[PDB]
Amino acid sequence: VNVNLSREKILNIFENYPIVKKAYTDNVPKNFKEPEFWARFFSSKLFRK
Amino acid sequence: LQATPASSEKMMLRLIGKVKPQRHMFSFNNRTVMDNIKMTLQQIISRYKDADIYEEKR
Amino acid sequence: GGYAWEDEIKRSWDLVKVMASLVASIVEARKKRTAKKNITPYQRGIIRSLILTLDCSEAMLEKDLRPNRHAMIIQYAIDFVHEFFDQNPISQMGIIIMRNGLAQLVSQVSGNPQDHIDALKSIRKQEPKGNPSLQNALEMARGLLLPVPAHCTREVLIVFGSLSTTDPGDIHQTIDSLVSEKIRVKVLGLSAQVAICKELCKATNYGDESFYKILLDETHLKELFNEAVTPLPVNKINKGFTLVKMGFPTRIFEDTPTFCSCHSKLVYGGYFCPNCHSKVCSLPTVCPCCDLMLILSTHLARSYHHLMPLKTFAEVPTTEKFRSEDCFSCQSRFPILKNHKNGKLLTSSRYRCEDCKQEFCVDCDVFIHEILHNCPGCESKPV
Amino acid sequence: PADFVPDSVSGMFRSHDFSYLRLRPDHASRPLWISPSDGRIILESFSPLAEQAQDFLVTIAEPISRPSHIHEYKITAYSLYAAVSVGLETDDIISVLDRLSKVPVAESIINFIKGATISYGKVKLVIKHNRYFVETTQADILQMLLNDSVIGVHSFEIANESVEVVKKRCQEIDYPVLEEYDFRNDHRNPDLDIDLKPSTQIRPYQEKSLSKMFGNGRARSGIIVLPCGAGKTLVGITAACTIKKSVIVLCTSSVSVMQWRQQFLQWCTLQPENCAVFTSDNKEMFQTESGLVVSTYSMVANTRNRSHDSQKVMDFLTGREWGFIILDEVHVVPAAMFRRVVSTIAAHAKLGLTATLVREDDKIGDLNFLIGPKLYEANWMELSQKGHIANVQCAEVWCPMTAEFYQEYLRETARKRMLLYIMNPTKFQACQFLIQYHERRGDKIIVFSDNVYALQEYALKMGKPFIYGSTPQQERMNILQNFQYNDQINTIFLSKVGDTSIDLPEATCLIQISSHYGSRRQEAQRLGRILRAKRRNDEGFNAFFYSLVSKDTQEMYYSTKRQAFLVDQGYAFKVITHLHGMENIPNLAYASPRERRELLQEVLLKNHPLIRKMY
Amino acid sequence: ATLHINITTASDEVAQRELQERQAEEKRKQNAVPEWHKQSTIGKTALGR
Ligand SMILES: [Zn+2]
Ligand SMILES: [Zn+2]
Ligand SMILES: [Zn+2]
Ligand SMILES: [Zn+2]
């Protein structure tokens, strides 16, 4: 299954959900790349919540 | 990742690397362990392949 | 416990059961004539700066309007641009669309209708999508209407198709800013009465709730588009009565092409500016070399009929002795007019004028209400 | 006439000049034209007040044709019988026809209305304890029948086998028999709790047909014709749920019996313990006081020495008074002993469900005597435009016969001519090109040919599966499953197996290579196998029907005869004498003259326990 | 079963819609009326080799 993530969708996720942007700042420049971070987030319980 | 089906007798997981390609053998005893390890490792190689594709496009 | 098939036959043929019909049409016509009796010489803003906001959302993909909503609005906007620049030449106009939550300005505020026609034709090809933003369109129009001079009235026409809008900020602050800038907004809605559009129209039009219009069918949309070409009557509190400086250019004749001052292209004809001797392609436009309006006498003449509109002609009484058996303007014989057997000359088609008392038929009456704007009898009177 | 002066332009009209009827002043609102010669009614659909007359005509008249603009109806006796039965009195019909017609209603038409409508409902056939009694409310009607006296308030018992003769004789006399089942007031037959499931929706045309059947509150025996895939089986289920009596259903194939059992157990609240099947494998009957039994025409009408179990089941069927019979594919009822299934079974109500109500002989006109009047006609264009059935593009490809093939066509007998005009190489090329083109479009294609040798030759030449009579059943199922699911198999070649009732996957293209003479029934049955496609919900979808015929042969005559029924339904067969892509297709079957000559010569080549061991 | 995400820059995605338009064009070819059905083939030459 494939889902399309536009850049504007990423910005809307950051604006509507500051918790995701907080997880974006301390992980993506540090440990893993941005698509890996989003694939981890979409399979996490945080996305379901 | 080459995986064995549940109908087969021996459970073993084959790993294929990239640049001669490196090949590794991972045999297991229990079928639930194979299921969990293959879904976790398939998810992480899917994430890494998506990251590599995004880096190659950029 | 029964069944639908066991019921008695519908017998719809047996359900069908089979003069003064002209009276039944003419009472509705008189109600139409009664609505035209409110004739007043209200002061209207001739010089207008109209901003046409056209929806280009997902609700524009609805097929309640033939063939889709978006194409019909674009075509009727083309017709509206043609009619508006035919009746209001001095007035300028810009076109904004709301697409994907953003206000896209597709033609700058200019007096040339051809650019707006080309812009609307270009927008007709694209597919509407997105969730419309009223606040973005209002802010873009506010930015567009900011350099408009005080004598030129600031009007916005919003053709809103959707029922809900998503804004990036508080739309009430935008409404208050538009009220503070004397910008009048008229909204034509497609589906139902949206409360924010009604509030915006009421605030911008000094409490007048009649500027929010919703269609009923195809022809009602045509009538609502044709209603907006008339200049809006201004309020008494508006004191922007300023003299406007313009010159009347002369159509230069030359067999040698010359560079125009507006487009820098080779045009044979033109209009030399009476102030700075610079030529332009078309009229009425600002002079590109000295920022002066350049109009003709006909451009002023097109908007005089709003300033002195004719009083509507009165239906003649049936018992009143008619002056002429035929018409006065076109000498058409008024018919026997017997709607029923003993009708005699009931609802006689003569329309008495209020000054010259001349008789006009219904064809002449609707022709003076549409194409002409002067009563022939009032001019034939030796005053 | 009305003293009308004959014009010189009325010379070639064979007494059909109806200009003596004075035109009404308010005629333009009235959409009808009544012809006094034969009761034919001309309706204009485009005028106002057309549907409010269209329902009146479909209640009181039989539609000859229903094209787009002008509809043509027939006032007949049987239509008037159903008209008065559903509650339309005689004066109401005359008053409405007078009100809704431009020309005045002629006195001959009015007298026909009075004559056909009166003397109806006098003689009635009732069944009491598996015994047929003909009953009349008036005494002297018994004494005026002295010719066909088969006697064995005022009623006398007739024999069970002689009921058809009585119905024919009373139809010849001005007293037609009334066949209505008052199931509401019938208490001798035990009721059933059969009822439709609430999840099952019924289409409005099916509701209209059942309102024609159950108009007066009493079940009326008759015939209902619907297109294939329009849900005639559901109409049968709903009729059984309406009557709520013991139901016997007759079919033509055992697979049809299985399908009818499946449809009964799915759409309505009938337990499997109330359902019984009388086939070769299954012969167990329901043990309850009432229920459903489904069987085949052949086993019920078997004159041969049947088995003991089948004899016991037949005795159970005959000794039980049935409240309802559903005859699927009623066009085969007028056969020799398929006629007798209405005599061997005492059924109060008889509903004949069909799709192809035509036969090449006149015995298709005997079903009003056997089952009852033709209750409902489905408008196939009206169902196609509403998406209930597919919008087929009927066509007829003209394949010219080659020089060496046509020479042999004329110096041959008709039986060999039949084989020879099928196998012309231009028909091979046309069929191959159509298969390639419609396979590139992604269409499931059925190629019908009644000739077995032609079917095999076409399939071997084109590399496609073929199904005919001698194919094993498991191979047929495997081929059909590959046709339904495998995308590499989009074309199946079917013989007359596909014409009769077998289950097929959904197909959108049909190519008719050959045919069984002028069988209109087979033509409409073949068209019915592409009329129920799944893609009907798709906008702009059209199914395709090709009848590949050899030019200047007798196949043209039979093809026109077969198409004569479908043009009555409204289908237009556009001729195709040219196919764009003939010269540019990669492979042409029999393109070289030597290959055509080889094909021609191949077609012509077709025509004491101890002494027992020594013996 | 397995999850895949697509990080898009929103410039290629429009072209992706054009690709969908290509599929829509294929949907026009699947439902296309054949050339012998839309017009009369009488004036053309007869079918053959
Ligand atoms: Zn210029
Ligand atoms: Zn100037
Ligand atoms: Zn006049
Ligand atoms: Zn006047």
PDB file of all heavy atoms in Angstrom, chain C residues 104-125:
ATOM      1  N   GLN C 104      -5.831  33.336  -6.492  1.00  0.00           N
ATOM      2  CA  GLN C 104      -4.993  33.483  -7.675  1.00  0.00           C
ATOM      3  C   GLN C 104      -5.547  34.634  -8.505  1.00  0.00           C
ATOM      4  O   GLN C 104      -6.674  34.562  -9.004  1.00  0.00           O
ATOM      5  CB  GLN C 104      -4.956  32.187  -8.480  1.00  0.00           C
ATOM      6  CG  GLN C 104      -4.107  32.261  -9.735  1.00  0.00           C
ATOM      7  CD  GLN C 104      -4.119  30.964 -10.520  1.00  0.00           C
ATOM      8  OE1 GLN C 104      -4.797  30.006 -10.148  1.00  0.00           O
ATOM      9  NE2 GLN C 104      -3.362  30.926 -11.610  1.00  0.00           N
ATOM     10  N   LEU C 105      -4.759  35.695  -8.633  1.00  0.00           N
ATOM     11  CA  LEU C 105      -5.124  36.832  -9.467  1.00  0.00           C
ATOM     12  C   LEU C 105      -4.774  36.512 -10.913  1.00  0.00           C
ATOM     13  O   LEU C 105      -3.598  36.319 -11.239  1.00  0.00           O
ATOM     14  CB  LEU C 105      -4.390  38.084  -8.995  1.00  0.00           C
ATOM     15  CG  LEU C 105      -4.417  39.289  -9.929  1.00  0.00           C
ATOM     16  CD1 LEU C 105      -5.834  39.796 -10.062  1.00  0.00           C
ATOM     17  CD2 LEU C 105      -3.497  40.384  -9.419  1.00  0.00           C
ATOM     18  N   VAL C 106      -5.781  36.448 -11.783  1.00  0.00           N
ATOM     19  CA  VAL C 106      -5.560  35.989 -13.150  1.00  0.00           C
ATOM     20  C   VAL C 106      -5.565  37.118 -14.166  1.00  0.00           C
ATOM     21  O   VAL C 106      -5.180  36.887 -15.324  1.00  0.00           O
ATOM     22  CB  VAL C 106      -6.580  34.906 -13.556  1.00  0.00           C
ATOM     23  CG1 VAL C 106      -6.631  33.818 -12.499  1.00  0.00           C
ATOM     24  CG2 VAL C 106      -7.942  35.513 -13.772  1.00  0.00           C
ATOM     25  N   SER C 107      -5.977  38.324 -13.782  1.00  0.00           N
ATOM     26  CA  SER C 107      -5.902  39.479 -14.667  1.00  0.00           C
ATOM     27  C   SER C 107      -5.881  40.732 -13.811  1.00  0.00           C
ATOM     28  O   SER C 107      -6.763  40.918 -12.968  1.00  0.00           O
ATOM     29  CB  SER C 107      -7.084  39.521 -15.639  1.00  0.00           C
ATOM     30  OG  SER C 107      -8.235  40.040 -15.002  1.00  0.00           O
ATOM     31  N   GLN C 108      -4.890  41.590 -14.041  1.00  0.00           N
ATOM     32  CA  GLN C 108      -4.725  42.793 -13.242  1.00  0.00           C
ATOM     33  C   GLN C 108      -5.864  43.777 -13.498  1.00  0.00           C
ATOM     34  O   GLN C 108      -6.593  43.685 -14.490  1.00  0.00           O
ATOM     35  CB  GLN C 108      -3.385  43.459 -13.549  1.00  0.00           C
ATOM     36  CG  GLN C 108      -2.182  42.724 -12.987  1.00  0.00           C
ATOM     37  CD  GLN C 108      -1.922  43.057 -11.532  1.00  0.00           C
ATOM     38  OE1 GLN C 108      -2.575  43.926 -10.955  1.00  0.00           O
ATOM     39  NE2 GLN C 108      -0.962  42.365 -10.930  1.00  0.00           N
ATOM     40  N   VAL C 109      -6.015  44.724 -12.575  1.00  0.00           N
ATOM     41  CA  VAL C 109      -7.074  45.725 -12.665  1.00  0.00           C
ATOM     42  C   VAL C 109      -6.742  46.664 -13.820  1.00  0.00           C
ATOM     43  O   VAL C 109      -5.826  47.486 -13.722  1.00  0.00           O
ATOM     44  CB  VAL C 109      -7.234  46.493 -11.349  1.00  0.00           C
ATOM     45  CG1 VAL C 109      -8.443  47.409 -11.416  1.00  0.00           C
ATOM     46  CG2 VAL C 109      -7.355  45.525 -10.185  1.00  0.00           C
ATOM     47  N   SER C 110      -7.483  46.543 -14.918  1.00  0.00           N
ATOM     48  CA  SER C 110      -7.232  47.346 -16.103  1.00  0.00           C
ATOM     49  C   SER C 110      -8.544  47.577 -16.835  1.00  0.00           C
ATOM     50  O   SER C 110      -9.517  46.840 -16.657  1.00  0.00           O
ATOM     51  CB  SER C 110      -6.212  46.676 -17.032  1.00  0.00           C
ATOM     52  OG  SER C 110      -5.960  47.477 -18.173  1.00  0.00           O
ATOM     53  N   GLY C 111      -8.557  48.616 -17.663  1.00  0.00           N
ATOM     54  CA  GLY C 111      -9.722  48.983 -18.437  1.00  0.00           C
ATOM     55  C   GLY C 111      -9.886  48.265 -19.755  1.00  0.00           C
ATOM     56  O   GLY C 111     -10.837  48.551 -20.487  1.00  0.00           O
ATOM     57  N   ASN C 112      -8.988  47.343 -20.090  1.00  0.00           N
ATOM     58  CA  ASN C 112      -9.082  46.612 -21.345  1.00  0.00           C
ATOM     59  C   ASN C 112      -9.844  45.314 -21.121  1.00  0.00           C
ATOM     60  O   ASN C 112      -9.357  44.444 -20.387  1.00  0.00           O
ATOM     61  CB  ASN C 112      -7.700  46.314 -21.899  1.00  0.00           C
ATOM     62  CG  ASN C 112      -7.750  45.651 -23.261  1.00  0.00           C
ATOM     63  OD1 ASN C 112      -8.722  45.796 -24.001  1.00  0.00           O
ATOM     64  ND2 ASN C 112      -6.696  44.917 -23.599  1.00  0.00           N
ATOM     65  N   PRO C 113     -11.026  45.139 -21.719  1.00  0.00           N
ATOM     66  CA  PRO C 113     -11.779  43.894 -21.505  1.00  0.00           C
ATOM     67  C   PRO C 113     -11.169  42.683 -22.187  1.00  0.00           C
ATOM     68  O   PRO C 113     -11.465  41.555 -21.773  1.00  0.00           O
ATOM     69  CB  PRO C 113     -13.160  44.217 -22.085  1.00  0.00           C
ATOM     70  CG  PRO C 113     -12.892  45.263 -23.111  1.00  0.00           C
ATOM     71  CD  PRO C 113     -11.755  46.088 -22.577  1.00  0.00           C
ATOM     72  N   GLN C 114     -10.334  42.880 -23.211  1.00  0.00           N
ATOM     73  CA  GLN C 114      -9.789  41.752 -23.963  1.00  0.00           C
ATOM     74  C   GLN C 114      -8.846  40.913 -23.109  1.00  0.00           C
ATOM     75  O   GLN C 114      -8.829  39.681 -23.226  1.00  0.00           O
ATOM     76  CB  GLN C 114      -9.074  42.259 -25.216  1.00  0.00           C
ATOM     77  CG  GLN C 114      -8.640  41.159 -26.170  1.00  0.00           C
ATOM     78  CD  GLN C 114      -9.799  40.298 -26.632  1.00  0.00           C
ATOM     79  OE1 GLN C 114     -10.871  40.803 -26.961  1.00  0.00           O
ATOM     80  NE2 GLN C 114      -9.587  38.987 -26.657  1.00  0.00           N
ATOM     81  N   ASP C 115      -8.060  41.563 -22.245  1.00  0.00           N
ATOM     82  CA  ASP C 115      -7.182  40.830 -21.338  1.00  0.00           C
ATOM     83  C   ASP C 115      -7.984  39.969 -20.371  1.00  0.00           C
ATOM     84  O   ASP C 115      -7.613  38.824 -20.092  1.00  0.00           O
ATOM     85  CB  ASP C 115      -6.291  41.806 -20.571  1.00  0.00           C
ATOM     86  CG  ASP C 115      -5.535  42.745 -21.487  1.00  0.00           C
ATOM     87  OD1 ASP C 115      -5.215  42.339 -22.624  1.00  0.00           O
ATOM     88  OD2 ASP C 115      -5.262  43.890 -21.071  1.00  0.00           O
ATOM     89  N   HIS C 116      -9.098  40.501 -19.863  1.00  0.00           N
ATOM     90  CA  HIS C 116      -9.941  39.734 -18.954  1.00  0.00           C
ATOM     91  C   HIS C 116     -10.628  38.581 -19.677  1.00  0.00           C
ATOM     92  O   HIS C 116     -10.790  37.494 -19.107  1.00  0.00           O
ATOM     93  CB  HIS C 116     -10.968  40.654 -18.295  1.00  0.00           C
ATOM     94  CG  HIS C 116     -10.363  41.858 -17.644  1.00  0.00           C
ATOM     95  ND1 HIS C 116      -9.061  41.886 -17.195  1.00  0.00           N
ATOM     96  CD2 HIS C 116     -10.881  43.079 -17.370  1.00  0.00           C
ATOM     97  CE1 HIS C 116      -8.802  43.072 -16.675  1.00  0.00           C
ATOM     98  NE2 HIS C 116      -9.891  43.813 -16.766  1.00  0.00           N
ATOM     99  N   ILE C 117     -11.026  38.796 -20.935  1.00  0.00           N
ATOM    100  CA  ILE C 117     -11.618  37.722 -21.731  1.00  0.00           C
ATOM    101  C   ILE C 117     -10.607  36.604 -21.957  1.00  0.00           C
ATOM    102  O   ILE C 117     -10.928  35.417 -21.811  1.00  0.00           O
ATOM    103  CB  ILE C 117     -12.158  38.281 -23.062  1.00  0.00           C
ATOM    104  CG1 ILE C 117     -13.372  39.176 -22.815  1.00  0.00           C
ATOM    105  CG2 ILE C 117     -12.527  37.159 -24.022  1.00  0.00           C
ATOM    106  CD1 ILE C 117     -14.469  38.512 -22.029  1.00  0.00           C
ATOM    107  N   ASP C 118      -9.366  36.968 -22.293  1.00  0.00           N
ATOM    108  CA  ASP C 118      -8.317  35.969 -22.489  1.00  0.00           C
ATOM    109  C   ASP C 118      -7.998  35.231 -21.192  1.00  0.00           C
ATOM    110  O   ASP C 118      -7.768  34.015 -21.206  1.00  0.00           O
ATOM    111  CB  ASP C 118      -7.060  36.632 -23.050  1.00  0.00           C
ATOM    112  CG  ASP C 118      -7.286  37.242 -24.418  1.00  0.00           C
ATOM    113  OD1 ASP C 118      -8.424  37.158 -24.926  1.00  0.00           O
ATOM    114  OD2 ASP C 118      -6.327  37.806 -24.984  1.00  0.00           O
ATOM    115  N   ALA C 119      -7.987  35.949 -20.065  1.00  0.00           N
ATOM    116  CA  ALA C 119      -7.739  35.310 -18.776  1.00  0.00           C
ATOM    117  C   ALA C 119      -8.842  34.320 -18.425  1.00  0.00           C
ATOM    118  O   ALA C 119      -8.562  33.210 -17.959  1.00  0.00           O
ATOM    119  CB  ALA C 119      -7.600  36.369 -17.684  1.00  0.00           C
ATOM    120  N   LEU C 120     -10.103  34.697 -18.657  1.00  0.00           N
ATOM    121  CA  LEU C 120     -11.211  33.788 -18.379  1.00  0.00           C
ATOM    122  C   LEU C 120     -11.181  32.578 -19.306  1.00  0.00           C
ATOM    123  O   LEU C 120     -11.492  31.457 -18.883  1.00  0.00           O
ATOM    124  CB  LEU C 120     -12.541  34.528 -18.502  1.00  0.00           C
ATOM    125  CG  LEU C 120     -12.842  35.533 -17.390  1.00  0.00           C
ATOM    126  CD1 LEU C 120     -14.206  36.174 -17.589  1.00  0.00           C
ATOM    127  CD2 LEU C 120     -12.750  34.867 -16.030  1.00  0.00           C
ATOM    128  N   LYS C 121     -10.795  32.782 -20.569  1.00  0.00           N
ATOM    129  CA  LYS C 121     -10.655  31.664 -21.496  1.00  0.00           C
ATOM    130  C   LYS C 121      -9.544  30.716 -21.058  1.00  0.00           C
ATOM    131  O   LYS C 121      -9.666  29.496 -21.214  1.00  0.00           O
ATOM    132  CB  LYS C 121     -10.391  32.183 -22.908  1.00  0.00           C
ATOM    133  CG  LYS C 121     -11.626  32.727 -23.608  1.00  0.00           C
ATOM    134  CD  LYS C 121     -11.324  33.108 -25.046  1.00  0.00           C
ATOM    135  CE  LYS C 121     -12.584  33.547 -25.775  1.00  0.00           C
ATOM    136  NZ  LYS C 121     -12.308  33.915 -27.191  1.00  0.00           N
ATOM    137  N   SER C 122      -8.451  31.261 -20.518  1.00  0.00           N
ATOM    138  CA  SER C 122      -7.374  30.413 -20.011  1.00  0.00           C
ATOM    139  C   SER C 122      -7.810  29.640 -18.770  1.00  0.00           C
ATOM    140  O   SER C 122      -7.451  28.468 -18.606  1.00  0.00           O
ATOM    141  CB  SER C 122      -6.140  31.259 -19.709  1.00  0.00           C
ATOM    142  OG  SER C 122      -6.415  32.217 -18.704  1.00  0.00           O
ATOM    143  N   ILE C 123      -8.573  30.282 -17.882  1.00  0.00           N
ATOM    144  CA  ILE C 123      -9.050  29.605 -16.676  1.00  0.00           C
ATOM    145  C   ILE C 123     -10.089  28.537 -17.017  1.00  0.00           C
ATOM    146  O   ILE C 123     -10.204  27.527 -16.308  1.00  0.00           O
ATOM    147  CB  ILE C 123      -9.571  30.651 -15.664  1.00  0.00           C
ATOM    148  CG1 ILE C 123      -8.426  31.567 -15.237  1.00  0.00           C
ATOM    149  CG2 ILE C 123     -10.169  30.015 -14.413  1.00  0.00           C
ATOM    150  CD1 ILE C 123      -7.280  30.830 -14.577  1.00  0.00           C
ATOM    151  N   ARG C 124     -10.829  28.714 -18.120  1.00  0.00           N
ATOM    152  CA  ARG C 124     -11.838  27.729 -18.516  1.00  0.00           C
ATOM    153  C   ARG C 124     -11.237  26.355 -18.794  1.00  0.00           C
ATOM    154  O   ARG C 124     -11.904  25.334 -18.590  1.00  0.00           O
ATOM    155  CB  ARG C 124     -12.593  28.221 -19.752  1.00  0.00           C
ATOM    156  CG  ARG C 124     -13.876  27.452 -20.039  1.00  0.00           C
ATOM    157  CD  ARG C 124     -14.167  27.355 -21.528  1.00  0.00           C
ATOM    158  NE  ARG C 124     -14.530  28.643 -22.108  1.00  0.00           N
ATOM    159  CZ  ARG C 124     -13.744  29.357 -22.901  1.00  0.00           C
ATOM    160  NH1 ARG C 124     -12.530  28.945 -23.226  1.00  0.00           N
ATOM    161  NH2 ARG C 124     -14.189  30.515 -23.382  1.00  0.00           N
ATOM    162  N   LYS C 125      -9.981  26.304 -19.242  1.00  0.00           N
ATOM    163  CA  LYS C 125      -9.359  25.022 -19.556  1.00  0.00           C
ATOM    164  C   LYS C 125      -9.030  24.226 -18.297  1.00  0.00           C
ATOM    165  O   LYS C 125      -9.150  22.996 -18.290  1.00  0.00           O
ATOM    166  CB  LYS C 125      -8.101  25.246 -20.395  1.00  0.00           C
ATOM    167  CG  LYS C 125      -8.377  25.842 -21.765  1.00  0.00           C
ATOM    168  CD  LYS C 125      -7.092  26.075 -22.540  1.00  0.00           C
ATOM    169  CE  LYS C 125      -7.386  26.546 -23.955  1.00  0.00           C
ATOM    170  NZ  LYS C 125      -8.248  27.760 -23.967  1.00  0.00           N
TER     171      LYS C 125
END
